[PDB]
Write a protein that holds these residues in place. Sequence first.
Motif, PDB file in Angstrom:
ATOM      1  N   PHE A 160      -1.367   1.609  -5.084  1.00  0.00           N
ATOM      2  CA  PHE A 160      -1.458  -0.089  -4.660  1.00  0.00           C
ATOM      3  C   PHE A 160      -0.872  -0.994  -5.587  1.00  0.00           C
ATOM      4  N   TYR A 172      -5.737  -1.136   2.762  1.00  0.00           N
ATOM      5  CA  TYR A 172      -5.589  -0.034   2.199  1.00  0.00           C
ATOM      6  C   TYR A 172      -6.414   0.922   2.414  1.00  0.00           C
ATOM      7  N   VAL A 175       0.947  -1.322   0.218  1.00  0.00           N
ATOM      8  CA  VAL A 175       0.061   0.072  -0.155  1.00  0.00           C
ATOM      9  C   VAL A 175       0.638   1.317  -0.109  1.00  0.00           C
TER      10      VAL A 175
END
Length: 330
Positions: A262, A235, A204
Motif C-alpha cells: 500500500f 485495498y 494498491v
Amino acid sequence: STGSATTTPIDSLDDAYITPVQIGTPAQTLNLDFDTGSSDLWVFSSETTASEVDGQTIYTPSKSTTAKLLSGATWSISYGDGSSSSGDVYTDTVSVGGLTVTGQAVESAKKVSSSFTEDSTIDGLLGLAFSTLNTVSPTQQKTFFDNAKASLDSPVFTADLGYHAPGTYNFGFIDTTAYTGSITYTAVSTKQGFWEWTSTGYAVGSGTFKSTSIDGIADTGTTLLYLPATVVSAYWAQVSGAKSSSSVGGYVFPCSATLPSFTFGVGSARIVIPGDYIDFGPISTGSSSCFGGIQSSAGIGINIFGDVALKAAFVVFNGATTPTLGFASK
Ligand SMILES: CNC(=S)Nc1ccc(Br)cc1Cl
C-alpha cells in the motif's frame, strides 16, 4: 543537546513499541509507549490501585530526591481505543537516551483502564503531540519534547520504527544514515493538537496512483492504518477471500492470501508499505482468519497514520515555529 533511544516492539505483531525512560533520582527506568497522538507523560506508580497493577514497573516518587508534588494538580485521560487513566502529578527529572529535562510533569496513575493493567509490558505513555492536548488541571503541562525543545541542537524529533525489529527515537538531530533518498516535508495543522497533515493519495500494490487528499494524523501510539472506507475497500478488494467482519470488528483475510503493498503520497513523494506489514495474524489462536492492518476510520472521525504506515518510513516531527512533518523511505 541531543538524545537517542532504541524503541522495541512489545510483541511479535508490533502491537506497540516501548522505549526506556529514566525518571527521578536515583533513576527509575520505566518502559514507556511514545505516543505522538497524545500529550501526557503518565506512569504506573506506587499510587496505582494495587488490583490494577499486574507486572508493570512502577514509579515511586517518594524514593526520588528530585520529585516534587505539583500541588492541587490532577489529570484524567481517555484514549481512542476506549482506555483511560487518572491520578495526580509530580515534577521530576526525566531522561531519554541521554537527553535530560528537569521539572518534567510526571503524571502518577491512581487508576488505569483494564487494557493497561492487562499489558504487562507498557509502564506508561510519553506523549509527543502538542501540549495543548495535555490534560493536567488546573495548570496544563508541557510535553517532554516541548520542555526539551529550546535546548536541542535542532527543534525536532524523529521516529524510525522497525518491522518486527527495534527502531529508534532521536531528539534534536536528523540521522542522515537512517534513510534513503531525500526527506519530503509536508504542512501540519495543529488546530486539533495533533501532528495532522494531508496525504496526496494512494496506490494498491502495482496499481495506478490515485491522487486524492487524505487528511490524517501521524500517530505512533496507534497500531494500525485507519483510512476512509472507500480507500480501505479498494485495498481489500485486491485480497482474495478478504471480508469485513462485524463480529471481529474489521477486515479479515485468509493468511494463505498474498497481501499487496500500500503506497501513500507525501507531496510528490511516495512511501510504500510492504504487504507483510499489513498482516496482524490469526484473530484467535489457531484460527485460519487473519486480521488486517489497514482498517476503516469511519467510526473514528479522523484518519490515523499509525505504526503500520509510520514504520515504513523515517519520520521527522519538526517542531519549528511553524511545525512540519518529514517522510523518507528507508
Ligand atoms: C489497544 N489499541 C491499540 S491502537 N493497539 C494495541 C493493540 C494490542 C496491544 Br497488546 C497493544 C496495543 Cl497499544
